[PDB]
Design an enzyme around this catalytic site. Structure first.
Site, PDB file in Angstrom:
ATOM      1  N   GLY A   1      16.743 -58.986 114.368  1.00 25.38           N
ATOM      2  CA  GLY A   1      15.607 -59.238 115.232  1.00 25.38           C
ATOM      3  C   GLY A   1      15.530 -60.688 115.659  1.00 25.38           C
ATOM      4  O   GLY A   1      16.266 -61.535 115.158  1.00 25.38           O
TER       5      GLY A   1
ATOM      6  N   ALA B   1      10.369 -66.162 119.014  1.00 23.18           N
ATOM      7  CA  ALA B   1      10.445 -67.382 119.804  1.00 23.18           C
ATOM      8  C   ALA B   1      11.070 -68.492 118.969  1.00 23.18           C
ATOM      9  O   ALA B   1      11.533 -69.502 119.495  1.00 23.18           O
ATOM     10  CB  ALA B   1       9.051 -67.791 120.261  1.00 23.18           C
TER      11      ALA B   1
ATOM     12  N   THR C   1      16.419 -66.368 115.019  1.00 23.97           N
ATOM     13  CA  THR C   1      17.035 -65.054 115.041  1.00 23.97           C
ATOM     14  C   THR C   1      17.419 -64.665 113.622  1.00 23.97           C
ATOM     15  O   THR C   1      18.029 -65.452 112.899  1.00 23.97           O
ATOM     16  CB  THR C   1      18.296 -65.054 115.926  1.00 23.97           C
ATOM     17  OG1 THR C   1      17.955 -65.533 117.236  1.00 23.97           O
ATOM     18  CG2 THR C   1      18.870 -63.651 116.035  1.00 23.97           C
TER      19      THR C   1
ATOM     20  N   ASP D   1       0.882 -67.635 109.719  1.00 24.75           N
ATOM     21  CA  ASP D   1       1.457 -66.632 110.607  1.00 24.75           C
ATOM     22  C   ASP D   1       1.549 -65.253 109.965  1.00 24.75           C
ATOM     23  O   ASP D   1       2.580 -64.585 110.065  1.00 24.75           O
ATOM     24  CB  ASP D   1       2.849 -67.073 111.073  1.00 24.75           C
ATOM     25  CG  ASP D   1       3.384 -66.208 112.202  1.00 24.75           C
ATOM     26  OD1 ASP D   1       2.572 -65.538 112.876  1.00 24.75           O
ATOM     27  OD2 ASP D   1       4.615 -66.198 112.413  1.00 24.75           O
TER      28      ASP D   1
ATOM     29  N   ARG E   1       4.473 -57.772 111.198  1.00 23.34           N
ATOM     30  CA  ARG E   1       5.885 -58.021 111.485  1.00 23.34           C
ATOM     31  C   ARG E   1       6.483 -58.975 110.451  1.00 23.34           C
ATOM     32  O   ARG E   1       7.704 -59.049 110.293  1.00 23.34           O
ATOM     33  CB  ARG E   1       6.043 -58.629 112.883  1.00 23.34           C
ATOM     34  CG  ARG E   1       5.381 -59.992 113.026  1.00 23.34           C
ATOM     35  CD  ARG E   1       5.495 -60.562 114.435  1.00 23.34           C
ATOM     36  NE  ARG E   1       4.810 -61.850 114.527  1.00 23.34           N
ATOM     37  CZ  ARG E   1       3.547 -62.001 114.917  1.00 23.34           C
ATOM     38  NH1 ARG E   1       2.827 -60.946 115.280  1.00 23.34           N
ATOM     39  NH2 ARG E   1       3.006 -63.210 114.960  1.00 23.34           N
ATOM     40  N   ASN E   2       5.615 -59.714 109.764  1.00 20.34           N
ATOM     41  CA  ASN E   2       6.050 -60.676 108.756  1.00 20.34           C
ATOM     42  C   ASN E   2       5.742 -60.197 107.345  1.00 20.34           C
ATOM     43  O   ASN E   2       5.627 -61.002 106.424  1.00 20.34           O
ATOM     44  CB  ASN E   2       5.378 -62.032 108.988  1.00 20.34           C
ATOM     45  CG  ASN E   2       5.900 -62.731 110.225  1.00 20.34           C
ATOM     46  OD1 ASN E   2       5.166 -63.454 110.900  1.00 20.34           O
ATOM     47  ND2 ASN E   2       7.174 -62.518 110.528  1.00 20.34           N
TER      48      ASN E   2
ATOM     49  N   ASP F   1       8.444 -65.217 105.881  1.00 24.81           N
ATOM     50  CA  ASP F   1       8.230 -66.243 106.892  1.00 24.81           C
ATOM     51  C   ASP F   1       7.241 -67.320 106.450  1.00 24.81           C
ATOM     52  O   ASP F   1       6.695 -68.049 107.279  1.00 24.81           O
ATOM     53  CB  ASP F   1       7.746 -65.603 108.193  1.00 24.81           C
ATOM     54  CG  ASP F   1       8.583 -66.010 109.384  1.00 24.81           C
ATOM     55  OD1 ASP F   1       9.784 -66.300 109.196  1.00 24.81           O
ATOM     56  OD2 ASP F   1       8.036 -66.040 110.507  1.00 24.81           O
TER      57      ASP F   1
HETATM   58  C1  LIG Z   1      16.185 -54.229 107.695  1.00 23.93           C
HETATM   59  O1  LIG Z   1      15.549 -55.175 108.554  1.00 23.93           O
HETATM   60  C2  LIG Z   1      15.208 -56.426 108.069  1.00 23.93           C
HETATM   61  C3  LIG Z   1      15.436 -56.892 106.734  1.00 23.93           C
HETATM   62  C4  LIG Z   1      15.068 -58.184 106.329  1.00 23.93           C
HETATM   63  N1  LIG Z   1      15.320 -58.557 105.054  1.00 23.93           N
HETATM   64  C5  LIG Z   1      14.960 -59.805 104.700  1.00 23.93           C
HETATM   65  N2  LIG Z   1      14.370 -60.720 105.499  1.00 23.93           N
HETATM   66  C6  LIG Z   1      14.106 -60.357 106.801  1.00 23.93           C
HETATM   67  N3  LIG Z   1      13.488 -61.301 107.675  1.00 23.93           N
HETATM   68  C7  LIG Z   1      13.521 -62.701 107.511  1.00 23.93           C
HETATM   69  C8  LIG Z   1      12.386 -63.487 107.865  1.00 23.93           C
HETATM   70  C9  LIG Z   1      12.406 -64.896 107.693  1.00 23.93           C
HETATM   71  C10 LIG Z   1      13.563 -65.522 107.165  1.00 23.93           C
HETATM   72  F1  LIG Z   1      13.558 -66.847 107.009  1.00 23.93           F
HETATM   73  C11 LIG Z   1      14.701 -64.757 106.809  1.00 23.93           C
HETATM   74 CL1  LIG Z   1      16.113 -65.489 106.164  1.00 23.93          CL
HETATM   75  C12 LIG Z   1      14.681 -63.363 106.981  1.00 23.93           C
HETATM   76  C13 LIG Z   1      14.444 -59.066 107.281  1.00 23.93           C
HETATM   77  C14 LIG Z   1      14.211 -58.613 108.605  1.00 23.93           C
HETATM   78  C15 LIG Z   1      14.583 -57.306 109.019  1.00 23.93           C
HETATM   79  O2  LIG Z   1      14.401 -56.807 110.304  1.00 23.93           O
HETATM   80  C16 LIG Z   1      13.777 -57.679 111.260  1.00 23.93           C
HETATM   81  C17 LIG Z   1      13.715 -57.019 112.618  1.00 23.93           C
HETATM   82  C18 LIG Z   1      12.844 -55.787 112.716  1.00 23.93           C
HETATM   83  N4  LIG Z   1      12.970 -55.335 114.146  1.00 23.93           N
HETATM   84  C19 LIG Z   1      11.631 -55.308 114.872  1.00 23.93           C
HETATM   85  C20 LIG Z   1      11.870 -54.848 116.310  1.00 23.93           C
HETATM   86  O3  LIG Z   1      12.505 -53.559 116.317  1.00 23.93           O
HETATM   87  C21 LIG Z   1      13.793 -53.562 115.677  1.00 23.93           C
HETATM   88  C22 LIG Z   1      13.669 -53.974 114.207  1.00 23.93           C
END
Ligand SMILES: COc1cc2ncnc(Nc3ccc(F)c(Cl)c3)c2cc1OCCCN1CCOCC1
Length: 297
Positions: A20, A23, A26, A133, A137-138, A151
């Site tokens: 995902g 802004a 990634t 935040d 979504r977070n 996050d």
């Molecule tokens: C299986 O999916 C995830 C596992 C995750 N596991 C760990 N952390 C995640 N997010 C994240 C957030 C902040 C950070 F600093 C880091 Cl390193 C990672 C993750 C985000 C993930 O998905 C984020 C995107 C979700 N999208 C939302 C839009 O539609 C498609 C799916």
């Protein structure tokens, strides 16, 4: 404590899939390959779109967060870009989860998630830390019975108007009590199974709407007591909003009589997992310590 944050070389990990983007950065599914080993270990990697000294200072704070309901920063790689390394959560984020399980989630799950998110935020508050935040979504799903805020530190490292307290919109003031406002919006997202707040309304109009006294509508599954909690989170006077420790108590109480507080069709056949199924989940993918979930009386 520097021992809590591993400094990685770009050479010892690889990005394999985009999960995902925002802004801000990634997020990728990545693979860590320990030096000297051939094994490839799945991780999550977020790459953001003198400064390094400030970045590391905040990263050490993010790596110090130790609580079952907040994700800890595990490592960082500083090159031309900043890359954050964290544990991968295969179930993904809670917003996607409630959307994909819409109307197929039991009240016991919804109320327990509210408890867990409040516990995570209360932990941050006990640490004197503001998240800034919070949004569905977070929040990530470790197992269906175990969610975690992620996050943390993002704002201080690097605007979601429709999640923000009025004073944050008008004056960019962020406190534990504005975190509570965003918690209220997050709960609303869960209870609507992932509806977009103020759908169809431009962000530029939000402050005026709030000043008029208008708020997000009561979700169809929410009884008045649950909706009143949300509304209390969105009071103009920050000091009039609930505290996270109070939210933990209230949602915990409701979780003990879930059908009294949420009205969900087919709810009587959507109970928490059996001890057998709970032990199996924990053995496989959730070996970390955590408070017992609140079951019904
Ligand atoms: C299986 O999916 C995830 C596992 C995750 N596991 C760990 N952390 C995640 N997010 C994240 C957030 C902040 C950070 F600093 C880091 Cl390193 C990672 C993750 C985000 C993930 O998905 C984020 C995107 C979700 N999208 C939302 C839009 O539609 C498609 C799916």
């Amino acid at each position: 404590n520097q021992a809590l944050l591993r400094i990685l070389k770009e050479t010892e990990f690889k990005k394999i899939k985009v999960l995902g983007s925002g802004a801000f950065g990634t997020v990728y599914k990545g693979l860590w390959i320990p030096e000297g080993e051939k094994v490839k270990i799945p991780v999550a990697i977020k790459e953001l779109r003198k400064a390094n000294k400030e970045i590391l200072d905040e990263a050490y704070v993010m790596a110090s967060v130790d609580n079952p309901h907040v994700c800890r920063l595990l490592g960082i790689c500083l090159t031309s870009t900043v890359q954050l390394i964290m544990q991968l959560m295969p179930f993904g984020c809670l917003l996607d989860y409630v959307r994909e399980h819409k109307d197929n989630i039991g009240s016991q799950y919804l109320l327990n998630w509210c408890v867990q998110i409040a516990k995570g935020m209360n932990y941050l508050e006990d640490r004197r830390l503001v998240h800034r935040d919070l949004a569905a979504r977070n929040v990530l799903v470790k197992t269906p019975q175990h969610v975690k805020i992620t996050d943390f530190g993002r704002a201080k490292l690097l605007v979601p108007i429709k999640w923000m307290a009025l004073e944050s919109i008008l004056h960019r003031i962020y406190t534990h009590q504005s975190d509570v406002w965003s918690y209220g919006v997050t709960v609303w997202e869960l209870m609507t199974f992932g509806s977009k707040p103020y759908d169809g309304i431009p962000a530029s109009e939000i402050s005026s709407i709030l000043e008029k006294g208008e708020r997000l509508p009561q979700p169809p599954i929410c009884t008045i007591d649950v909706y009143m909690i949300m509304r209390k989170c969105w009071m103009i006077d920050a000091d009039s909003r609930p505290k996270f420790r109070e939210l933990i108590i209230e949602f915990s109480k409701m979780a003990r009589d879930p059908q009294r507080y949420l009205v969900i069709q087919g709810d009587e056949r959507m109970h928490l997992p059996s001890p057998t199924d709970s032990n199996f989940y924990r053995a496989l993918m959730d070996e970390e310590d955590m408070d017992d979930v609140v079951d019904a009386d």
